[PDB]
Amino acid sequence: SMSTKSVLFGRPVQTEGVPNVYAGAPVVPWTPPEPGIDNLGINSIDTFAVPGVGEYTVAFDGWVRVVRSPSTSGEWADAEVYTNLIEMKMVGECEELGKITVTLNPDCLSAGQIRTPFDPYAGEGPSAKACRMAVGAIFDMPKLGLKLMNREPIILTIDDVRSIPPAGAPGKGQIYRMMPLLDVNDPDGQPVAYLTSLRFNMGGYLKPDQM
Amino acid sequence: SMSTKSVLFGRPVQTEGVPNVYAGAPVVPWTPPEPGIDNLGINSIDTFAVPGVGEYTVAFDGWVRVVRSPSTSGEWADAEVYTNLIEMKMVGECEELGKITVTLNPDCLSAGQIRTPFDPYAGEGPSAKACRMAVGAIFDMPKLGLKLMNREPIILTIDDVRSIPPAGAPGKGQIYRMMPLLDVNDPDGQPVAYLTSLRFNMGGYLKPDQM
Ligand SMILES: CCCCCCCCCCCCCCCC(=O)O
Ligand SMILES: CCCCCCCCCCCCCCCC(=O)O
């Protein structure tokens, strides 16, 4: 494999020789872009269930860096783009759980793709694409003295994709009822908590000093 | 991890010394069972999208072997059970795709759990549990000269669980729009096909010679 990661959640994408894209760069709709690493803002709302203890909803803000493969075509209708999520930092705060910092698990390749869906029956603009990303994350919860991780990838989706990157777009975590979160120090143990829902919005390109 | 597999989709469960359970063994509702390996029938209906070629719906029949951990309690309400899917074989056939045989990917630990949901549905009541399994599979398609595998786990769920095992129960694959299926001989390549939907039914205990 082209990846050194121990667990791959999708297709590896090269970053060497791929330029970073920052604020100032246009987002042109319906246009397959040249390969780049998108430096993008993001916010989310995450709900966590702690068995026998409680359920907590936490708002997060931060950024992601996502490398894109070259498009498989210069024509939008045929174009596919493969992505890797290569760096993240999101922060949120909560009285009960403290300050939570979400980053990537270095043992996992977080990977996704953008392509025409097989079920274009959702009211999306004509020709719009579907974006997905499968993520291995770390949830640092210092107030609880814990760091948590997921073995099952968190599936994050953006529908009605009319530009790449889909700046400004709303997305969802596809979690059916519960997603186990494991103590990094006891990953073969019982889950410590469950992520029960996640919604997010993409922002736009950031300046380097905003990260 | 105590599991030697390179990709872990959940919690490992002990199999050594755990007896097999076969037809004849009763399934009494509301009763956490002693640890065992359930030998169960199963059927499913799977839809596959092959880009630029077609979409095909195929019915499968076969069996699964699922090991259960000891229950965390002898009282149903408190009981949780952890599971691993340790062996399977399902077969279906389709003119365009040929005979398809589904087995486990030996590199992946397929793992799940049964516990009370945090969000019980109106038709579940406060006593029913929810069952989930995260699966790494192989799809053998000799007609096409290919074997395919998934990197994102196939999330298989059963709601309104009132017995363990949930013999006879309907279940669903929680696949959002598309699940990439990769050539085992080109696993970092573009997907060959996508699993776009899956539903299944659990059968009951099988005789040893029915597998
Ligand atoms: C545990 C919470 C994780 C949230 C992390 C956000 C996931 C990434 C956002 C959705 C996919 C991003 C797609 C951008 C693709 C592109 O750069 O063109
Ligand atoms: C293409 C993938 C097909 C996979 C088919 C799913 C196999 C059945 C697993 C569903 C959960 C099993 C629950 C049984 C639990 C128990 O033994 O008590």
Residue numbers in the entry:
A (entry chain A), B (entry chain B): 0 to 210
Task: Tell me what the authors wrote about this structure, in their words.
The high reactivity of enediynes with DNA makes them quite toxic.
Access to the biosynthetic gene cluster of dynemicin has enabled the in vitro study of gene products within the cluster to decipher their roles in assembling this unique molecule. This paper reports the crystal structure of DynF, the gene product of one of the genes within the biosynthetic gene cluster of dynemicin. The structure of DynF was determined to a resolution of 1.50 Å with a final R work and R free of 0.16 and 0.19, respectively. The size and shape of the ligand, as well as its binding environment, are suggestive of a 16-carbon fatty acid, which was confirmed by gas chromatography–mass spectrometry (GC-MS) as palmitic acid.
